[PDB]
Design an enzyme around this catalytic site. Structure first.
Site, PDB file in Angstrom:
ATOM      1  N   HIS A 238       0.282  38.441  56.240  1.00  0.00           N
ATOM      2  CA  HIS A 238       0.115  37.646  54.613  1.00  0.00           C
ATOM      3  C   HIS A 238      -1.229  37.798  54.288  1.00  0.00           C
ATOM      4  O   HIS A 238      -2.202  37.935  55.027  1.00  0.00           O
ATOM      5  CB  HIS A 238       0.451  36.229  54.904  1.00  0.00           C
ATOM      6  CG  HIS A 238       0.683  35.478  53.712  1.00  0.00           C
ATOM      7  ND1 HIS A 238      -0.260  35.057  52.894  1.00  0.00           N
ATOM      8  CD2 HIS A 238       2.027  35.065  52.972  1.00  0.00           C
ATOM      9  CE1 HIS A 238       0.282  34.445  51.943  1.00  0.00           C
ATOM     10  NE2 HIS A 238       1.556  34.596  51.791  1.00  0.00           N
TER      11      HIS A 238
ATOM     12  N   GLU B 233       3.063  41.361  48.026  1.00  0.00           N
ATOM     13  CA  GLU B 233       2.352  40.363  47.424  1.00  0.00           C
ATOM     14  C   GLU B 233       1.399  40.992  46.345  1.00  0.00           C
ATOM     15  O   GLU B 233      -0.033  41.432  46.620  1.00  0.00           O
ATOM     16  CB  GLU B 233       1.227  39.652  48.466  1.00  0.00           C
ATOM     17  CG  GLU B 233       2.155  38.963  49.628  1.00  0.00           C
ATOM     18  CD  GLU B 233       1.084  38.208  50.383  1.00  0.00           C
ATOM     19  OE1 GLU B 233       0.526  37.037  50.030  1.00  0.00           O
ATOM     20  OE2 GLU B 233       0.763  38.743  51.366  1.00  0.00           O
TER      21      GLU B 233
END
Lengths: 237, 237
Positions: free
Chosen positions: B91, B161
């Protein structure tokens, strides 16, 4: 000062380990603490919550909550059953670039949540070889400890990352003890100082007998009850 | 390709949050799969209430090793034994703050597979990278480096992302889909690609109906059942 024996399981322990954790607790039934992985904390509390042993976590974030994927708050640790948290361990200072300011912020979060912070400090091989041991500890102790520290809300562990003889340990612990008195006065003199290098049943008597060593932060010898409890038994002598 | 809606609670969630987690599970309890990735402290208790339900449960990060001297880290085996089937890896919140390289991410994915976890691998470019017209160059590098040999449609899911529109998303997801076919062939064409920028109830239909978008990785809008379930409702229309 009441001695304090802390075990850090590091990245070891699952539900299969709960038997072993109970065996450590039943051997206690000094203060004792076991710091388990965050995944195991709630289940550890479920079996041990009443008993004598203290339960801890191994790190926490600086914020109360928020957008920090893979991080655990001090509030999460507290609610899962921890009373203590290790902060600034050498395995993290290095790999995760946890500076003293980062460590201080983590300690402040631990206190907001009602945890006792077990703050680790220590110099590297290159630092000791450079004759910088006391310069490093002076900086780390100042920077890592927030204002507001007390003998109730922190415990310090010295890690000889460079490795240590009991003379080496005596010198460092005396230095740290004087530092705590210098900054926090008579209450600083009550802050427990744990030795957090290699502590095994084979060297526990010598290390825990040392002036200004108030306990230990035990890694591999905390994974089995037989080892951990044999170290704890030194206080009988 | 079956669509997949993943919620990432990040550093939110305690025992007090179990009611809301149940509300998410009950709202799902046909055409899509749903996953909620809770903090590691909450995982076992989440499994205790939801383990027999339709919802999938996940973790938010794991270490590269099976076990060992890694204070404050959680192994993939710990996640699995606590009840996770999935783990978010790489992430943007961790690649930045913890300097998780593509090589570091690859090693984490490999650990996830050893433990029998599906790795939900995140990739994406920074604002500076987007401003410099390097989006495709960055994704080329990240996708190659972050994915180990041995990836399948069963053992990975990819989330894009935009760390930095539907046209942006269609272009990127097409590119990513083509890279998956290029490396892994027909099986690579079956790897689910999730959009993981700002997904809210108000943009979900447009985003989830985009070619080569097989679901979403949802942050804030996964914290409450009303928001999460509203997004999921898009597959009914």
């Amino acid at each position: 000062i009441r001695p304090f024996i802390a075990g850090n399981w590091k990245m070891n322990g699952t539900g299969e380990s709960l038997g072993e954790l109970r065996a450590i607790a039943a051997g206690i039934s000094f203060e004792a603490l076991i710091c388990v992985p965050a995944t195991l904390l709630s289940r550890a509390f479920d079996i041990l919550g009443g008993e004598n042993i203290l339960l801890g976590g191994q790190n926490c974030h600086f914020d109360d909550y928020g957008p920090y994927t893979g991080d655990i708050s001090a509030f999460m640790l507290k609610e899962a059953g921890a009373s203590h948290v290790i902060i600034g361990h050498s395995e993290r200072r290095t790999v995760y670039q946890e500076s003293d300011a980062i460590v201080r912020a983590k300690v402040q979060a631990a206190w907001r949540a009602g945890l006792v912070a077990l703050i680790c400090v220590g110099e590297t091989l290159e630092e000791r070889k450079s004759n910088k041991v006391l310069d490093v500890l002076t900086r780390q102790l100042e920077g890592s400890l927030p204002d507001g520290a007390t003998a109730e809300n922190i415990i310090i562990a010295y890690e000889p990352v460079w490795a240590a003889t009991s003379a080496d340990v005596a010198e460092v612990h005396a230095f740290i003890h004087h530092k705590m008195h210098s900054r926090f006065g008579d209450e600083g003199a009550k802050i427990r100082l744990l030795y957090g290098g290699s502590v095994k049943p084979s060297n526990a008597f010598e290390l825990l007998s040392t002036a200004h060593v108030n306990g230990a932060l035990i890694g591999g010898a905390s994974l089995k009850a037989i080892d951990f409890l044999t170290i704890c038994d030194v206080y009988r002598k």
